[PDB]
Amino acid sequence: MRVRIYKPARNAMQSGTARTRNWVLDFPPADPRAIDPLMGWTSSDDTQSQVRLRFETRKQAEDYAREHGLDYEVIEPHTRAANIRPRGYGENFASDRRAPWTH
Amino acid sequence: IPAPEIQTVTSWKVACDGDEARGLGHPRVWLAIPRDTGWVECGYCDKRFVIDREHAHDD
Amino acid sequence: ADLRKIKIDDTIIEVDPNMTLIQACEMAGIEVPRFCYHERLSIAGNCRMCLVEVVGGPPKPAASCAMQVKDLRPGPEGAPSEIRTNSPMVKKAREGVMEFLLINHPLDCPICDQGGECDLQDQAMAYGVDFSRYREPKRATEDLNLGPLVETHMTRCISCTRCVRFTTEVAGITQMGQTGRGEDSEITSYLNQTLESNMQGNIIDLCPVGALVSKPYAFTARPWELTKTESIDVMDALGSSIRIDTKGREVMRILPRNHDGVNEEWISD
Amino acid sequence: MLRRLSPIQPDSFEFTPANLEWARAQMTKYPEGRQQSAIIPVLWRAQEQEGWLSRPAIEYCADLLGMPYIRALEVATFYFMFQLQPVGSVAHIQICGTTTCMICGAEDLIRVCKEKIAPEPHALSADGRFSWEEVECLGACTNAPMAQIGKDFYEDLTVEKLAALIDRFAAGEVPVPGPQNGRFSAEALGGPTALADLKGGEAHNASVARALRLGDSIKRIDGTEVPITTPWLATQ
Amino acid sequence: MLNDQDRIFTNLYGMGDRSLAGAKKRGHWDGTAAIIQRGRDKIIDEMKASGLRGRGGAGFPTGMKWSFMPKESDGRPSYLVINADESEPATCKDREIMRHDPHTLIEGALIASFAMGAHAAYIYIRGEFIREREALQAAIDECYDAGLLGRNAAGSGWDFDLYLHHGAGAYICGEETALLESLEGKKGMPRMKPPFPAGAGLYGCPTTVNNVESIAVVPTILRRGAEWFASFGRPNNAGVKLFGLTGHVNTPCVVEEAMSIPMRELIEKHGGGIRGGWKNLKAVIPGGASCPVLTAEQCENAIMDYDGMRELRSSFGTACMIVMDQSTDVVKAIWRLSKFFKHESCGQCTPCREGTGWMMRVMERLVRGDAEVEEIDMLFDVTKQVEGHTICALGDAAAWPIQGLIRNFREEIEDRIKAKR
Amino acid sequence: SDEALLELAEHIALRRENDVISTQVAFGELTVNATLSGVIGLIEFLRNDPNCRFSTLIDITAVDNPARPARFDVVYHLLSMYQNQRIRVKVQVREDELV
Amino acid sequence: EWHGWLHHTYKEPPTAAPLAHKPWEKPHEPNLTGSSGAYHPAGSLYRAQPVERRDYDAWQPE
Amino acid sequence: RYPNGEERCIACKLCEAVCPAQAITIDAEPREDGSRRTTRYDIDMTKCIYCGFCQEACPVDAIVEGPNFEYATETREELFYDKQKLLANGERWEAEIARNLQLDAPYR
Ligand SMILES: Cc1cc2nc3c(=O)[nH]c(=O)nc-3n(C[C@H](O)[C@H](O)[C@H](O)COP(=O)(O)O)c2cc1C
Ligand code: SF4
Ligand code: SF4
Ligand code: SF4
Ligand code: SF4
Ligand code: SF4
Ligand code: FES
Ligand code: FES
Ligand SMILES: [Ca+2]
Ligand code: NA
Ligand SMILES: [Zn+2]
């Protein structure tokens, strides 16, 4: 089937970056899930979606998909470039600031 | 929905833990009664604390 | 383009001298705890969680978020300047600040939507002690009326002022401020009015604790249950990078994800 | 203590013409585009005119200086000399409670206030004419214990003397400020131990002498009491 | 000892004539033009040699601070800000200078401002000093009329403007960077350093902040001479100093004396001695609220100067003392300071916004004895978590008073716990 | 036992240089990384050698490492009741390679 | 009321040491499994009005 | 329930997270009064291993394993417990459950 190779992005709700180092090969859900009539649970016949592989480099993920005859898409990551402030903390008190800094 | 329990207090800050002995309630939290409405509700047990304005003593 | 060598713990690295120590540490892959600093907001320096040791400087720990590399006094003979993120001073400083952050914090994790993806929980686990010494009553705070998108539990606020800095600098509105003084200083909107901005939903992400949370999402899920899909938004032609969080058959919420060239890390309401 | 505006607010505020003139002069002390610097003095004048700082005053002064309302509200709540609710119409007694005044009998003075003015601070007396609060050091510690009423320091106090002072205010009088034990300003009791020869040159010290001349100790300032002068505008 | 001929503030009590003419009789505004024509370098070099040290609380060499200011203007004006906040709980020396001997402050402002190349100076006075500000403003207007301030200030060829700005009741606004924030129309929260004020201060322009007494002393040092000033006091502790004697002395007062005077001689000569005799002395807070308390025995040979107080593990501070006799509850005295610092913290940064309240509430229980003895070491540990970890030195100032109590009066704390239990 | 296990690892590395790729002592346990072609010879030496008498085979298992060129590790756990010591032997195996 | 005593959990019988009861408690029921009062899930075919489930609202033509 | 009659569960989902057998399923919304409460609370009693981890994880003593063990059923679906079934068990067994909590409190 089709697998996704991508680098998971930082969770916006948190500032930590430890869950952004690894590449993952994922088997995205293949068919719709259903509602169990008896209890309302989420039913599925797609056990392949249980599989989630973890790699250190994009090459390792791409290799594995090739050796195993998997059609894959590689989604490139969007690293956040450092916002280098030329004056650093001092720009809060620059004489040419549009408005006073709020602290 | 009516409150399960109302207590009238003379302080603007109250603590609720479910009123249960030695670790049988809920985590102990401090609640602030607004001066506008005069009541606050516990997020764990839904107990409502209502200020007694005439006797309400500022700390 | 005159890169400067700096030694962080045991890593020698070459960086732009205008970088702050916290930016240099991330470039070296060294984790530094933080609450008030954000990459895209003005440096505040108020949480004091990012304190590091500058070898050879005064015994005071230095806030790594506010100290540029060029401010470090060069090492003897021109050796690279050294900063420690692992020393006993740093360990004690982080434990002390974490203790101060928790003495007045409410015991709300079970009823707080941040639970499970909370920087306060996670850094308290990694950088604080496992017990309490505080035996006094805790502070209790009144909540705000910010409108139908942001629910407030201001007793949880840790006074990082991220919300104030985002709404003022990025959203371009002047409704939020910090009134009063001391431990009774309150983050607030003027006249307790609802925020008027189609960018306001971003403060839910920025708030490190469950002080500012999403009303529509409130109580419906925990972070560990959600399946995450990195996708592209179509509500406008900007094509913002987003994360769609699903549980079973339903989308549960929509979060921004970073794209420096399109939407940075913001989305509209 | 939470710093909040009073729930009951006047409908509007307006500077008197002479106070609006005075405020505009204050804005000329600071460089172009820095007129927001005058927020504290201008907010102070609004309180002096009305006796307390109301919301329309804060918004009026923010508009005058081109500040956001939240920015002006932050100033009003951060600085504790601003009264965000009505105080005693006649006088508001501020008693120092810090250490030096505490070990010289400040707490006994606070007991006098509770008996005569009101059981709790910031609370109006039944008349609505007097209120009190405890404050931190007023920088007159050699004259401890001391209190501030209106513009003036009443110094070297005692329960008997403070009680008598409150009685004179209650009768419509303004007792003489300054040391109440006969001292001049801050020299040792019983004559200066230094610079002793100068005695006699002035009847009262600078604070008392001005208070007696102008009689604005507890007076609502309308701006026509002191001429408005801007000598710095000539320097350019 | 110091005699009237050597006292710089010669009308400190305001007993003599307070008019501008009366000030000129006392030698003020005497040859101001000549001093200024000596140039910037000579004035700074003289301030360096005089050995003056900041009288605001930290004692940093004043001339050195003046030499951080840029020599050429890069487009941004320079500023001198004179610190008249004086909200330290025992400190009242500056009140006298502003209302009784203002012309010492005004002339020093002009000379100091010229030395830094500043055309404007701002005095930040606390809002409670309403009559001091009215009196100081009247003197500034006299000087403007006489030509001592303005287009060609005192005939020196320097355009100088002096403005008076007042606060509204915040002790943190005396901190140098918080002052600039307050002066700009903001709530007075300190800034971290860097940037340093000499680089970016008021309006993001180079600024120097000096205490009132630091500036008011300048003209006399330049007129009489740097060597004369350095004659008084011990080496590295030069000059004459205004002292505040407060608390349980017979005659509390403010007086000018030489540096490095023994504490006892100061008290007995000008304070009239301790209430009930020297043997009634219990404790002394030597330099304002933020100075660790001293026992009765440590005060025996204490020398009132920067090195003397440091040697006793205390601080010289502002040199205004709180004298407590044997009838005073010292734990209650230090507790009321903890209540003061809790009341004054700006709330910006975590260790002080949260730490000061915690320290205050533990101190309150120690006053009553409602504590365990292990909480004394716990409290000492908490103070160490605040000290050195905050943005500004108020965090440190809130920890030192408690640390001094534990170091010097621990047995008195342990007695209260035993007494109650 | 830490010095003992390091000494024992040198003895094995010396006597079976070509079998042994490396040795490690972590958490008080000695692990020997061996080549696939020499694993049987090495385990035979460990069983019979006087200093290291590993005559009890505790178990054999595998570990999957899909990110690695040789995805499988085969792990041999051996015990010596006479010397009172343990050892682990690890060999890296590619998919479809024979062991 | 008697379960704890009968299973030796508590020493004293409810006659001597009665159990405290809250006003919102409900009377005891035996096992009802083979009867019509047996519990069944809301979607059970025993219910005869099984609760219909959905997680989206469908558009209705005018 | 609390002594005041309100439900103890506040839909924190710690029991659902710790459950080794994934026997618990929870859905929650803000109640009409704004309270944090569940709308679904299912325990699959044929998945449950009766380990008691859920009652250890619960911060408010909402979910407990009670003293009853004689509830064998004639059909399998009678062992799919929904929220009302579990609450009914709590209202009938509260007196014994509360006493057991008091007896074991010194060890918890
Ligand atoms: C909390 C705090 C309050 C301060 N208050 C004053 C003050 O009231 N007056 C003063 O001159 N310096 C005060 N200072 C010291 C100033 O920060 C600064 O060091 C000083 O004004 C510099 O002037 P100087 O070197 O001439 O003494 C304070 C410092 C802190 C940390
Ligand atoms: S903000 Fe974090 S630490 Fe605070 S109650 Fe919520 S989950 Fe717990
Ligand atoms: S509400 Fe949140 S973002 Fe705003 S100051 Fe408080 S903790 Fe920071
Ligand atoms: S130490 Fe206290 S006064 Fe200083 S910046 Fe921090 S919170 Fe404000
Ligand atoms: S007792 Fe049952 S429901 Fe509770 S955690 Fe264990 S398996 Fe899950
Ligand atoms: S039963 Fe307890 S642990 Fe489970 S969701 Fe409810 S409160 Fe949380
Ligand atoms: S991240 Fe540096 S002080 Fe907050
Ligand atoms: S302690 Fe009261 S005026 Fe200073
Ligand atoms: Ca309710
Ligand atoms: Na948040
Ligand atoms: Zn409760």
Residue numbers in the entry:
A (entry chain Q): 1 to 103
B (entry chain R): 3 to 61
C (entry chain G): 2 to 270
D (entry chain E): 1 to 236
E (entry chain F): 1 to 421
F (entry chain C): 6 to 104
G (entry chain q): 63 to 124
H (entry chain I): 56 to 163
Which passages does the manuscript contain on this structure?
Respiratory complex I is pivotal for cellular energy conversion, harnessing energy from NADH:ubiquinone oxidoreduction to drive protons across energy-transducing membranes for ATP synthesis. Complex I transfers two electrons from NADH to ubiquinone, feeding electrons to the electron transport chain for O2 reduction, and captures the free energy released to transfer four protons across an energy-transducing membrane, generating the proton motive force that powers ATP synthesis. All species of complex I contain 14 conserved core subunits (or their equivalent) organised into two seven-subunit domains: a hydrophilic domain that catalyses the redox reaction, and a membrane domain for proton pumping. The core subunits of human complex I share higher sequence similarity to complex I from P. denitrificans (Pd-CI) than to other bacterial models such as Escherichia coli or Thermus thermophilus.
Here, we present the 2.3-Å resolution structure of complex I from the α-proteobacterium Paracoccus denitrificans, a close relative of the mitochondrial progenitor, in phospholipid-bilayer nanodiscs. Three eukaryotic-type supernumerary subunits (NDUFS4, NDUFS6 and NDUFA12) plus a novel L-isoaspartyl-O-methyltransferase are bound to the core complex. During processing, relatively poor map quality was observed for the distal membrane subdomain, and classes that lacked density for it were again identified suggesting the subdomain was lost prior to reconstitution. Both datasets yielded maps for intact Pd-CI-ND with global resolutions of 2.4–2.5 Å, and as no substantial differences could be identified between them, they were combined into a final 2.3-Å resolution reconstruction. We conclude CI-PIMT has diverged from the PIMT family, losing its catalytic ability, and assume the canonical Free-PIMT performs the PIMT role in P. denitrificans cells. Pd-CI is insensitive to NEM12 and displays all the structural hallmarks of the closed state. Specifically, the ND3 TMH1-2, ND1 TMH5-6 and NDUFS2 β1-β2 loops at the domain interface and ubiquinone-binding channel are well ordered in their closed-state conformations, ND3-Cys47 is buried, NDUFS7-Arg77 points away from NDUFS2 adjacent to a loop element, ND1-TMH4 is bent, and ND6-TMH3 is fully α-helical. We propose Pd-CI is stabilised in the closed state by the PIMT, which binds on top of the ND3-TMH1-2 and NDUFS2 N-terminal loops. In addition, a bound Ca2+, coordinated by the NDUFS2-Asn8, Asp49 and Glu54 carboxylates, Arg6 carbonyl, and one resolved water (a second is assumed), stabilises the NDUFS2 N-terminus and bridges it to the β2-β3 strands. Density in the central polar region of the channel has been assigned to a partially inserted ubiquinone-10 molecule with its headgroup within 4 Å of ND1-Arg38, Trp41, Met244, Lys295 and NDUFS7-Arg77. As both the enzyme and ubiquinone are oxidised, the observed binding pose is not a reactive intermediate, and the substrate is required to move further into the channel for reduction.
